[PDB]
Amino acid sequence: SIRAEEISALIKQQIENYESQIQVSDVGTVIQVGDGIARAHGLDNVMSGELVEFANGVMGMALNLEENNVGIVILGPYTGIKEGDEVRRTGRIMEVPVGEALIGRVVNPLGQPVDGLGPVETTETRPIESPAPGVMDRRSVHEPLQTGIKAIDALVPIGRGQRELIIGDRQTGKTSVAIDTIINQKDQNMISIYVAIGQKESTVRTVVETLRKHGALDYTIVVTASASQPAPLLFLAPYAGVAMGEYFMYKGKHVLVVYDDLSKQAAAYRELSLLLRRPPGREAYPGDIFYLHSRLLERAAKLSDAKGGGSLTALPFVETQAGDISAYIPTNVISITDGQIFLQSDLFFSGVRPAINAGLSVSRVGGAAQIKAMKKVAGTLRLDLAAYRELEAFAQFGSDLDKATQAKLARGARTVEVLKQDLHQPIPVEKQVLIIYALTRGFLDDIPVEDVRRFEKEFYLFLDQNGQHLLEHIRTTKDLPNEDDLNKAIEAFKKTFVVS
Amino acid sequence: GDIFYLHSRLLERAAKLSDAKGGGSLTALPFVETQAGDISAYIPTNVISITDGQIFLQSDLFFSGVRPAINAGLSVSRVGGAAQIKAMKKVAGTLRLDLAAYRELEAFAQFGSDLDKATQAKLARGARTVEVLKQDLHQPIPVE
Amino acid sequence: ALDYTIVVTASASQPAPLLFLAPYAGVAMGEYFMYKGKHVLVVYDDLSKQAAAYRELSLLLRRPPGREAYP
Amino acid sequence: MTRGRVIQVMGPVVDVKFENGHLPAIYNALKIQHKARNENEVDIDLTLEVALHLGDDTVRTIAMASTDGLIRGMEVIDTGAPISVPVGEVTLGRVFNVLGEPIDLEGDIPADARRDPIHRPAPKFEELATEVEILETGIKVVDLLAPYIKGGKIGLFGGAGVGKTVLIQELIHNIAQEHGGISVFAGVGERTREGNDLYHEMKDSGVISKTAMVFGQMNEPPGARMRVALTGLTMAEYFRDEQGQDVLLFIDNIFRFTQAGSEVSALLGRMPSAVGYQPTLATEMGQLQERITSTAKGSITSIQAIYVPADDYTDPAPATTFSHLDATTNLERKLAEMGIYPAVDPLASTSRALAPEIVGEEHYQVARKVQQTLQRYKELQDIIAILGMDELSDEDKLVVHRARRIQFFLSQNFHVAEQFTGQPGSYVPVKETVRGFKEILEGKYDHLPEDAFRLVGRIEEVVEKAKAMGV
Amino acid sequence: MTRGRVIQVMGPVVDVKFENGHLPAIYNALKIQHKARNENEVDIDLTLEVALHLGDDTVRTIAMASTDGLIRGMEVIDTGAPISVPVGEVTLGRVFNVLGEPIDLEGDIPADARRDPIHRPAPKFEELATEVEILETGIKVVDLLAPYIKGGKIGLFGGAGVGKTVLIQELIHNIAQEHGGISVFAGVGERTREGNDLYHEMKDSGVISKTAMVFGQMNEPPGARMRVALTGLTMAEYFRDEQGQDVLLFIDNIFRFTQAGSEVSALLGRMPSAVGYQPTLATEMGQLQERITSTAKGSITSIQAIYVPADDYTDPAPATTFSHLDATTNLERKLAEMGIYPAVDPLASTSRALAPEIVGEEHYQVARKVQQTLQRYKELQDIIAILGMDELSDEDKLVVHRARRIQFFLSQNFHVAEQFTGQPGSYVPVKETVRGFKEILEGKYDHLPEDAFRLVGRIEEVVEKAKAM
Amino acid sequence: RPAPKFEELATEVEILETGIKVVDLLAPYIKGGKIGLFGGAGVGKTVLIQELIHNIAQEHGGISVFAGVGERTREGNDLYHEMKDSGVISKTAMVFGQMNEPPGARMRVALTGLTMAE
Amino acid sequence: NQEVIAKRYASALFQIALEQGQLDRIEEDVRAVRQALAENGEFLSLLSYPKLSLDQKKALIAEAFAGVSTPVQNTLLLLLERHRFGLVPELAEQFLALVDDARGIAKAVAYSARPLTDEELRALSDVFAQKVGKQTLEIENIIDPELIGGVRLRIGNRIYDGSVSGQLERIRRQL
Ligand SMILES: Nc1ncnc2c1ncn2[C@@H]1O[C@H](COP(=O)(O)OP(=O)(O)OP(=O)(O)O)[C@@H](O)[C@H]1O
Ligand SMILES: Nc1ncnc2c1ncn2[C@@H]1O[C@H](COP(=O)(O)OP(=O)(O)O)[C@@H](O)[C@H]1O
Numbered sequence A: 001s002i003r004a005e006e007i008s009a010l011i012k013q014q015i016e017n018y019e020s021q022i023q024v025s026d027v028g029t030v031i032q033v034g035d036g037i038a039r040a041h042g043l044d045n046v047m048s049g050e051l052v053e054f055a056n057g058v059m060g061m062a063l064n065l066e067e068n069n070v071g072i073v074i075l076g077p078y079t080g081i082k083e084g085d086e087v088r089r090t091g092r093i094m095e096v097p098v099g100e101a102l103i104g105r106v107v108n109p110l111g112q113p114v115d116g117l118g119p120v121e122t123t124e125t126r127p128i129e130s131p132a133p134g135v136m137d138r139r140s141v142h143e144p145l146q147t148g149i150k151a152i153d154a155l156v157p158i159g160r161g162q163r164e165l166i167i168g169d170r171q172t173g174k175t176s177v178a179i180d181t182i183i184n185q186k187d188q189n190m191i192s193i194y195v196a197i198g199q200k201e202s203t204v205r206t207v208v209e210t211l212r213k214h215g216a217l218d219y220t221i222v223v224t225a226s227a228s229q230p231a232p233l234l235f236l237a238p239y240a241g242v243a244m245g246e247y248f249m250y251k252g253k254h255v256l257v258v259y260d261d262l263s264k265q266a267a268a269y270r271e272l273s274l275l276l277r278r279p280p281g282r283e284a285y286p287g288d289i290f291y292l293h294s295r296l297l298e299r300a301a302k303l304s305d306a307k308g309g310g311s312l313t314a315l316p317f318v319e320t321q322a323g324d325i326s327a328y329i330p331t332n333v334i335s336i337t338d339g340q341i342f343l344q345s346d347l348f349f350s351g352v353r354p355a356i357n358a359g360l361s362v363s364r365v366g367g368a369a370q371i372k373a374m375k376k377v378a379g380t381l382r383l384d385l386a387a388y389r390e391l392e393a394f395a396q397f398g399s400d401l402d403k404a405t406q407a408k409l410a411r412g413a414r415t416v417e418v419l420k421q422d423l424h425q426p427i428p429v430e431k432q433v434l435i436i437y438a439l440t441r442g443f444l445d446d447i448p449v450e451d452v453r454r455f456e457k458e459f460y461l462f463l464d465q466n467g468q469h470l471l472e473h474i475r476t477t478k479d480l481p482n483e484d485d486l487n488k489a490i491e492a493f494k495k496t497f498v499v500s
Numbered sequence B: 001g002d003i004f005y006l007h008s009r010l011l012e013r014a015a016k017l018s019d020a021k022g023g024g025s026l027t028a029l030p031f032v033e034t035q036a037g038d039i040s041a042y043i044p045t046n047v048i049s050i051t052d053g054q055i056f057l058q059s060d061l062f063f064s065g066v067r068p069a070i071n072a073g074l075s076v077s078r079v080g081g082a083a084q085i086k087a088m089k090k091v092a093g094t095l096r097l098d099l100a101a102y103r104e105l106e107a108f109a110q111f112g113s114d115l116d117k118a119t120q121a122k123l124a125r126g127a128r129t130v131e132v133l134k135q136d137l138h139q140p141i142p143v144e
Numbered sequence C: 001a002l003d004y005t006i007v008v009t010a011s012a013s014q015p016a017p018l019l020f021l022a023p024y025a026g027v028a029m030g031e032y033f034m035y036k037g038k039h040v041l042v043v044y045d046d047l048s049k050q051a052a053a054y055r056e057l058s059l060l061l062r063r064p065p066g067r068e069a070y071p
Numbered sequence D: 001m002t003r004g005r006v007i008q009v010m011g012p013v014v015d016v017k018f019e020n021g022h023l024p025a026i027y028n029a030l031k032i033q034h035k036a037r038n039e040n041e042v043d044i045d046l047t048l049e050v051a052l053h054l055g056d057d058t059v060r061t062i063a064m065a066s067t068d069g070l071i072r073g074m075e076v077i078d079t080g081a082p083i084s085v086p087v088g089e090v091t092l093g094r095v096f097n098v099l100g101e102p103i104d105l106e107g108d109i110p111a112d113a114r115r116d117p118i119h120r121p122a123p124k125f126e127e128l129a130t131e132v133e134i135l136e137t138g139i140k141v142v143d144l145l146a147p148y149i150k151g152g153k154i155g156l157f158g159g160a161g162v163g164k165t166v167l168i169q170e171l172i173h174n175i176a177q178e179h180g181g182i183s184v185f186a187g188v189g190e191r192t193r194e195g196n197d198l199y200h201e202m203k204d205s206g207v208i209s210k211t212a213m214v215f216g217q218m219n220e221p222p223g224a225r226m227r228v229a230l231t232g233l234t235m236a237e238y239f240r241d242e243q244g245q246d247v248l249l250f251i252d253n254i255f256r257f258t259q260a261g262s263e264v265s266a267l268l269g270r271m272p273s274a275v276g277y278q279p280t281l282a283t284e285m286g287q288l289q290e291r292i293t294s295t296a297k298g299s300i301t302s303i304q305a306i307y308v309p310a311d312d313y314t315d316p317a318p319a320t321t322f323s324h325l326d327a328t329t330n331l332e333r334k335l336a337e338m339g340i341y342p343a344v345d346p347l348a349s350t351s352r353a354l355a356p357e358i359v360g361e362e363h364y365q366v367a368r369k370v371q372q373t374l375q376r377y378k379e380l381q382d383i384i385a386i387l388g389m390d391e392l393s394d395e396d397k398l399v400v401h402r403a404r405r406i407q408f409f410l411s412q413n414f415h416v417a418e419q420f421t422g423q424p425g426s427y428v429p430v431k432e433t434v435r436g437f438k439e440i441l442e443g444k445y446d447h448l449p450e451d452a453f454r455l456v457g458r459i460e461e462v463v464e465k466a467k468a469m470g471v
Numbered sequence E: 001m002t003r004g005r006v007i008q009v010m011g012p013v014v015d016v017k018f019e020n021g022h023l024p025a026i027y028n029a030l031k032i033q034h035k036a037r038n039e040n041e042v043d044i045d046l047t048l049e050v051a052l053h054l055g056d057d058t059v060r061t062i063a064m065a066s067t068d069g070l071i072r073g074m075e076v077i078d079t080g081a082p083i084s085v086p087v088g089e090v091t092l093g094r095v096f097n098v099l100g101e102p103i104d105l106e107g108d109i110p111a112d113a114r115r116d117p118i119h120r121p122a123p124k125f126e127e128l129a130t131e132v133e134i135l136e137t138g139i140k141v142v143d144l145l146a147p148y149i150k151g152g153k154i155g156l157f158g159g160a161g162v163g164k165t166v167l168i169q170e171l172i173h174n175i176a177q178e179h180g181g182i183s184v185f186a187g188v189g190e191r192t193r194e195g196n197d198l199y200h201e202m203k204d205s206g207v208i209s210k211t212a213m214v215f216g217q218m219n220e221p222p223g224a225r226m227r228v229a230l231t232g233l234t235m236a237e238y239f240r241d242e243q244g245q246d247v248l249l250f251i252d253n254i255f256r257f258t259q260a261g262s263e264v265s266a267l268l269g270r271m272p273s274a275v276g277y278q279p280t281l282a283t284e285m286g287q288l289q290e291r292i293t294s295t296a297k298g299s300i301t302s303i304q305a306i307y308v309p310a311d312d313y314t315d316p317a318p319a320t321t322f323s324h325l326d327a328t329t330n331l332e333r334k335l336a337e338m339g340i341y342p343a344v345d346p347l348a349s350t351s352r353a354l355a356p357e358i359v360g361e362e363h364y365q366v367a368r369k370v371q372q373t374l375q376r377y378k379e380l381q382d383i384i385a386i387l388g389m390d391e392l393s394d395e396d397k398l399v400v401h402r403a404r405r406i407q408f409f410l411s412q413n414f415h416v417a418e419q420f421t422g423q424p425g426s427y428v429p430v431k432e433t434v435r436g437f438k439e440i441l442e443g444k445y446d447h448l449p450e451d452a453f454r455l456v457g458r459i460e461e462v463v464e465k466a467k468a469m
Numbered sequence F: 001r002p003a004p005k006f007e008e009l010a011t012e013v014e015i016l017e018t019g020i021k022v023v024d025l026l027a028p029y030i031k032g033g034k035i036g037l038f039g040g041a042g043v044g045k046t047v048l049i050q051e052l053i054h055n056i057a058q059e060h061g062g063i064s065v066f067a068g069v070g071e072r073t074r075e076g077n078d079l080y081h082e083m084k085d086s087g088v089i090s091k092t093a094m095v096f097g098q099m100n101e102p103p104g105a106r107m108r109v110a111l112t113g114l115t116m117a118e
Numbered sequence G: 001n002q003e004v005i006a007k008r009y010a011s012a013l014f015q016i017a018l019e020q021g022q023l024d025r026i027e028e029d030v031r032a033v034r035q036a037l038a039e040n041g042e043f044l045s046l047l048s049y050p051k052l053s054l055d056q057k058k059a060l061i062a063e064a065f066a067g068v069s070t071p072v073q074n075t076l077l078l079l080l081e082r083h084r085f086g087l088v089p090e091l092a093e094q095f096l097a098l099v100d101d102a103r104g105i106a107k108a109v110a111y112s113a114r115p116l117t118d119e120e121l122r123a124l125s126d127v128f129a130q131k132v133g134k135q136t137l138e139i140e141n142i143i144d145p146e147l148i149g150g151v152r153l154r155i156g157n158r159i160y161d162g163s164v165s166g167q168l169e170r171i172r173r174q175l
């Protein structure tokens, strides 16, 4: 039953001046160090959640303000912190430097520049833990978040302000879907933020380079917490991403924040809680592993018009194990978000990329977010895929009745060939509308399966030089053009297209 | 540690005293609620190893129409025979025999070969035993 | 066979340290003949009993237990 | 004139030390109002409630908001009572916080209003009322196989993303307008989005001015997510005690009550129980759950969504709340993945009100015959999985042929799910779903395709949808 | 002064107390050297790694050897740095343990050699490589179907009897031949007789004069086996940073690394997380495998055998390694018994690199067509079994007659197998193997017999083996 | 007391002849060995126990000892009245510490029956 | 666990007594306090009583220990506030154990059958003080007659048995 503050020289300096009054200090000395978690006697004017600075220069967050010691969590490399180092308190509660001058930089969860392009001149700080927008602070999601992926923008559409989980196994294309929906925001007024949690530094470097190639760093901010970084920096990367997005949200700008593998944050918080000897629960995650992600993702709102109208749309990622959507962390994050995009593994092995299982991918709030043309076009798209998948699940061989022989199977094969994309090439929404129109109305029933991709590739170049009236109509009025002219345009391309 | 001792300390108190002590008895009926029908849980295997037999109630037999839901194949009595009257004993013997026979022969009747008459008579007998052993709610029957 | 074999016994009625020290006594009796140049065959009947007795020793000495309380 | 210092601050949990003989009590509210003397301090307006006594004049508390900013040695003002909540018909048409304060931006409740404490003992045995009457909902699984009791507690067990918020919103859409008595929606620990959609639906559908709303949604620290169910409950207890009024009380995710208890219980000095839950898991949800009762003065009919973590119905937080509920509807992930909405397991769902002296003999035997055919098909699942349909002995083929129709006809299109799919939704009376299931079991609809029965209100619409398919 | 004093000894865990303000930092090394002053005491040379700080001026350490003989009160010397391991040219050809001491009987490294610390932060975001370059191994089935990356992590799922060590020796030979790249082997917790077998095979091969080995084998305490991959990796980092060259780094059975850290954490008294793993599973694996990257000056690529406990890929010890893997090369026994060397399974070996942006368009189309023809031929096995070889069709008979040529062409003559079969062996570049599989898939080399395609380097010299027969 | 030592034991395996044909043929009993009965009720476990006691005390002159360690006071009383009825009781010594007793008594009942047999 | 927590307090009081330079006035006072608290045991039950406030207990110590030294009084008033007044005699005994290492004196116990004269006691004290390294050595004799005409000396934890150990080693080496 030993208490940690029972240190011999410390007891000696306590019976230095017991009854004689001693003015209390705002510095403290470390008692214990280990596993990125320290304790310090002293610091009685510290407050809960304050940034404290070690003599090394490493920051720290004071979690537990116990009776004679302060439980400090070391935010950085802790191998230079010894017992006896003095801890100095700053006076701020978990602030990251946030500004307009942070756009295009790659930072750690404490707002320090990691890419090595010099300092970041910001004048304003934002707290990491802050209350979410309340029930009267919000507004219903009505603005489209255009990803440029046809399967997302048609089947599971994202609104500006909703939280949609992107879920799937390892090597199923979650990061590519993120970088595609970040590269597509170049024309829009979206400020993207990519938060990489527990990834390899090599892949984060290639991610940042493919963002720099497509001009995406004019609006995106990369918050990097590596796999080699300690769990206190992994735990704070999404909160730093949200705190950097809220500056632009509460000024009226629209922010997209992407969390690559929140399962890594949950595992690092399991680490940070078990090293604090908090008793674990199901799958050894702590009791507040739900509250870990709910304090994060409920802070992503569509604000009302009384508060400026800004929005934080969040795309968190959860990595399953063998396609298990009924695990503990996937079902914790499903019941926080407004939908899921289930990137299935064997559809990714068979070649369907993006490999969206459209049966299990739902968008709750989306559907009021489609652009009034994608509604008309995709409402007859979704059931073709649904019927096609659950009848190719059994009808592999044997002759079938002519409806279920061709008008289901061949139409579904044309849907699958329509919805495939190559990565880092986002399609604008009007060309998605016209291709899925030419699919669903029946203009791809003549063209064989192997030519749908080249039909789409040449049809886009056809549209860019002839159908500017169609594309400008879908830009301005957001509705489908009059179907006589549009059928005339598609038949005018089918007269030109050379079938192979 | 003493959760078995918790249940056994009260379930041993239910006794039948001898004629020197007055002859008065105390029979007990403890209940244990399983979780998705795992007999192999901790508190069920502590209470099963104290009581003098058990009556397994199953939802598979509750929704197939057999109310009361007794799995009489797995349900054990550890007195049994010394409890019953002579008239119940004489006929409960052959009822247990042909209900066990029907529980064995029903295994080979869900698909396939459409068994011969020599045990189809036993299956019809056993279906009539199952239909006899049903009751309503709060209608107890005397022994006669 | 008792012209060339040695039998080392830690039966179940002995305490857990003798059960723990039986196989190390086996190799310590075999390595003499090994470094003199002979060829030795040492047979450890039920090392799981030895692992369970070391589990008992580590638990009664208040050491932090791992999986199945093996230290 | 007795105040107390702060000794320890441990996340949600604060230690407070008073003078000798002036400890408040358990469950009293403690206030902190600090004024940020210098630039190294933060303004604090924080309320604490007492959970324990520890000896040496110390008090183990649970905070109701975020403790980020508390300094050791900060003074605490005692109140001398639990968290008192403004109550009455002032609460009708307003949205509230955990502390009783209004959040709906329409003004503040005056200080001279009547305030009831959150914590009180349960209603006694002599006061309760046990008359069983059926609440008609218009949902075919609920009306046929697990009827709801007008004045008893009701559960909506589901996993994550399986359909219980849609089911609770359609029960509001089918019940709360025509109810003729006070509603209380206390949302415990669900999406703050769904507190906004639901409030604007109450505004434009004109339900509100009879509904009091209490939101302690999932952004709140767990001290708020515990006591939110109790402040919504004391708002409803005013009506059924003082006014004798029939009360609806919808609680969304009463699981989050026990989860928020589990988050604080490690820091309260308690040992962990099995599965990481607090030791008092059965009595913290017995002191809440025995105050939602229908007494002799008035009746509370309460429908409670209950989350089931990791789709594990054997978890101790859903398993110890089956013993509190009169009617349950156990949603299943498999039925939602087959497209059967509501995803109600027809066999795991039970009720006190499915008995012939209450529900009628025709209703009762049609419900039992439906359960019998679905259980026989559930026994045939393995043979159908491995060997296929071709081995079954011409009565089992008929049982499968009827049970596909039954488990698809239990699915229904909702008014809430009009925004999902465009299909306008249906309300089905009890006698018509009894007649439709009797006509399915008679064999009157064996010639129709089995996909003609999905998402259909009544069986004339089965006939219409099968004609539109082209049979 | 930095002299210490032992307080507690309990298994490997040793508590050492210094004076105030003279504490050692975490991960430092502590030399305990004791000459026994009487017949009671025992001579001790023993190194400790600082792991925690307990307060009361004490320090909890984990041990690198056996703690038998440690007396409460004996002197401990603080090194002032973590475990310093010799690097340079003096490590090539030498077998080392975790402390950087030579296991061999060849000699000792002098004290004036360069020794660099064992624990180092990973190379920063500023210093990495922006692009993804290909690592050209000269094996055809590797360079065509599961290509490697400079700075990659590759998984071997072979086991014994499939020629895992033959691939290891040939990758060392080919990279040190063509790329000028030193290799480093690191056997994290492996059988000692198999370590000696591997050393004698690499001595007979002649590959060793270019590699360096580290064996902290199974007999050593868990504090040794947790730090063995780090002292193979510190030897690789000298040739990455100071020399600037493409270095291999073989970690045999990295599951031994994960469970060595697990039992270290169980000895240290931490609460175990999911599946018995140390709470710090993903961050210990990250502190290993984020130093295996390609920087601007050189690279370290890594080939890592993976245990796959109770053969599920969802156990946390395979799952936190598979999130760092860039490629897998499955070795199958039925391809070694067929006569195809190497025994790389062509359909189960996958790669993240095999994509047209990284590798190229022609390589990608040829590789995917090879996988399609071998998949069709693997489907046709039961049809050949029940219908016989004839009467299938013309098309799938052409598929079998094409795909068996492709399947036997995937075998090479290694430089390693020259002392076994007498054939000189070949390094096949990636452009010539893409051209060779393209010319096979066109049908240009269809008329040649299939035993000319076995054990042949490239496509220009299958004509001579068809000419000799 | 400690177990008997290494040189005090018997060097050969001898067979405890029971007189029961299933036991004598298909599962013989070591004279000095440890046997397992796996039976519930209705299988005549008490009748098998009684004929073991009767045949051993008839043909070998061997006393038996029943040590009932924490099992069902009702079955213990049934077994004692069947000892009295069979008349083989005058051969056995009975020790009962049942489920109703604290676990110290259930710990030491097997050892006090053992020190009565020794 | 109690003895090491007593050792921490005793080492802190030892460091402040060595730093303040008032070592004898601390040592004799802690010896008197240890004797007074070993005399009566009801004082701990008086100070463990909950209805007495902490100021009343502090005034009770300040009245009852009014003559003690100031660092000792500060140490005991810190011990009271930590609920560690049940740990004070062990830390007093370990403080007197640790102060004799500063004085260099060791305490030895000699079991002799006959009471030895003071000259031989001083001779063995000087001899084993030169052997063990002490400046002087304190010898405590006993009147236990079980030894066979000899004396056995205990230097801390290392003993010098030469009275019946001769016959014991003789009957051990004979068999
Ligand atoms: N639409 C696409 N077309 C072609 N290739 C694609 C497409 N989408 C993704 N890929 C490829 O799939 C590979 C893996 O995808 P990605 O790494 O984004 O998935 P991930 O879940 O992030 O993997 P990990 O979690 O292991 O990092 C990438 O190399 C990428 O090139
Ligand atoms: N009656 C229904 N008809 C169609 N879809 C439904 C129905 N009920 C639920 N769903 C779908 O199932 C999901 C259930 O989500 P919801 O019930 O709101 O979350 P939770 O169950 O976690 O509270 C919704 O996304 C909705 O798309």
Ligand SMILES: [Mg+2]
Pocket (backbone or CB within 6 Å): A174, A175, A260, A261
């Ligand atoms: Mg990714």
Ligand SMILES: [Mg+2]
Pocket (backbone or CB within 6 Å): D164, D165, D190, D191
């Ligand atoms: Mg919900």
